[PDB]
Amino acid sequence: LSDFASSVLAEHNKKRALHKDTPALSWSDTLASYAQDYADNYDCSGTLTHSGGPYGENLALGYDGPAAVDAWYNEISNYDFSNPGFSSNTGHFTQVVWKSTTQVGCGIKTCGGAWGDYVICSYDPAGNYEGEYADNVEPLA
Ligand SMILES: [Mg+2]
């Protein structure tokens, strides 16, 4: 794996191990080809829009690879494990730790000095299935 791929995969697994019964991810070359193509074509507008593809997806603007994973994960501060499910400010975290997700692949592209890096990670199987959060988003162990 490349330095970007290794550091990003490692950051996912460092976080997932903090949670009960959550296995590590592996890198997928096909997922990364998908994500890097979307990163290649990103319009550097400052707006984050999902690709609408078949995989799970996390997006960030202004962080390198590992720092993006860190920011996604830090949404745990808004997650109420007593009331699991989706919210606009927890969906990145729940995809990072989604138990049934087994593979991740990501891409990156600079958007200049005013935006920093655009980072997209694609996930297979996808996370954030409504009604399945309790089975796939475990509490801190
Ligand atoms: Mg996103």
mmCIF file of C-alpha atoms in Angstrom, residues 13 20-21 34 46 56 79 82 89-90 97 103 108 116 118 126:
data_model
loop_
_atom_site.group_PDB
_atom_site.id
_atom_site.type_symbol
_atom_site.label_atom_id
_atom_site.label_comp_id
_atom_site.label_asym_id
_atom_site.label_seq_id
_atom_site.Cartn_x
_atom_site.Cartn_y
_atom_site.Cartn_z
ATOM 1 C CA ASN A 13 -8.249 0.618 12.563
ATOM 2 C CA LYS A 20 -16.562 -3.430 21.459
ATOM 3 C CA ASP A 21 -16.603 -6.278 18.949
ATOM 4 C CA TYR A 34 -13.464 4.698 -7.185
ATOM 5 C CA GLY A 46 -16.064 24.032 -0.749
ATOM 6 C CA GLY A 56 -20.508 3.980 1.947
ATOM 7 C CA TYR A 79 -23.582 10.141 19.443
ATOM 8 C CA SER A 82 -29.040 5.201 24.327
ATOM 9 C CA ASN A 89 -23.281 15.251 12.750
ATOM 10 C CA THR A 90 -22.670 11.563 13.539
ATOM 11 C CA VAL A 97 -16.891 2.170 13.130
ATOM 12 C CA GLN A 103 -13.080 -2.745 3.321
ATOM 13 C CA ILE A 108 -7.197 12.761 -2.112
ATOM 14 C CA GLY A 116 -6.687 22.374 1.675
ATOM 15 C CA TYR A 118 -10.240 17.016 -0.432
ATOM 16 C CA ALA A 126 -21.874 0.431 3.182
#
